[PDB]
Subunit: 83 residues, 5 copies
């Protein structure tokens, strides 16, 4: 299984987006993530206020490892994987 998380520049602060409407609910909880819908968007998302680095470390503890990272617009995105 894969995981996509992102953050808007600057990377040193949050919030960090950690999931879509169908993300594993137990994982989102383990990260202290909340479900919300930002106005202007027509989809729900999970987020945490922690900067990306903090979230990457937490995910390592749950078995996820970073495969790739890229930028698009002013968004930094990380693709994680787990057997």
């Amino acid at each position: 299984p894969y995981l996509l998380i992102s953050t808007q520049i600057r990377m040193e602060v949050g919030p960090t987006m950690v999931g879509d409407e169908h993300s594993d609910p137990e994982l989102m909880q383990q990260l202290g993530a909340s479900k919300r819908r930002v106005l202007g968007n027509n989809f729900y998302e999970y987020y945490v206020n922690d900067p990306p680095r903090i979230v990457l470390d937490k995910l390592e503890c749950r078995g996820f490892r970073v495969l790739s990272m890229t930028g698009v617009g002013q968004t930094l995105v990380w693709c994680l994987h787990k057997e």
Copy 2:
């Protein structure tokens, strides 16, 4: 063999492009893809309504693995590979 899939940000929702007009039709069918031609294009494309994460998880079951991910414009691209 390789596979290129993409999506425009936001990455939490679809649609997700999963093929060119020469794509393996059996795989496109297993992904639940549909063929269409956007206005202004002289070529067809396969796409699904599921967000990128869901599509990666499905491909992982088909034997694919993400080698790389990148951004170009407002588009997110994943290059997958299967032995």
Copy 3:
């Protein structure tokens, strides 16, 4: 040795720039590549009219594998390697 190939978006269609004037003439021929200059082009380029995926697949048969992929401007670039 390394290889660099590219294409402008959309990624679904060609052409695909598969080499520079110093590229292996053998390799360029197995991929059905044609050399040329693009007016203003003080240099040459090898391309094929196939979309990136087709090309990536053919290069695989020749021992080349994708190490990295990135976007720059409206251009997608793949970096392949071979023992």
Copy 4:
């Protein structure tokens, strides 16, 4: 554990940002990094004036390896990992 460092082009000169305010102070101490808040921000950043190459080599000695690199806007970002 993961580490995120960055720099603005040109990549040949500094400064290089080596951490947020929750960064390991011992590690920061070791790179000879300094803390400062830049006009426009509201949070602190650790940084060195050495260019990225020197920083990557210093981090290699500490057991950190580069997992990925990417540009976003005018910023180069490197994601490093350590067992």
Copy 5:
């Protein structure tokens, strides 16, 4: 040790930046690099006229391998590593 090399699009031609002013002179010489300070730059840079592909191959000979590639602005950057 790490290495950072780059080039402006188009990637088919050079020059290719191969180092900063603190770069290993001995390594710079095996590449046949030259030193120069571009106007409007408060720093020196080592370059070669060879397009990226040739430099990548020359560096493979000396024990360097590509870890990541990315684009920032009109520049393509390669991060190479050597045990």
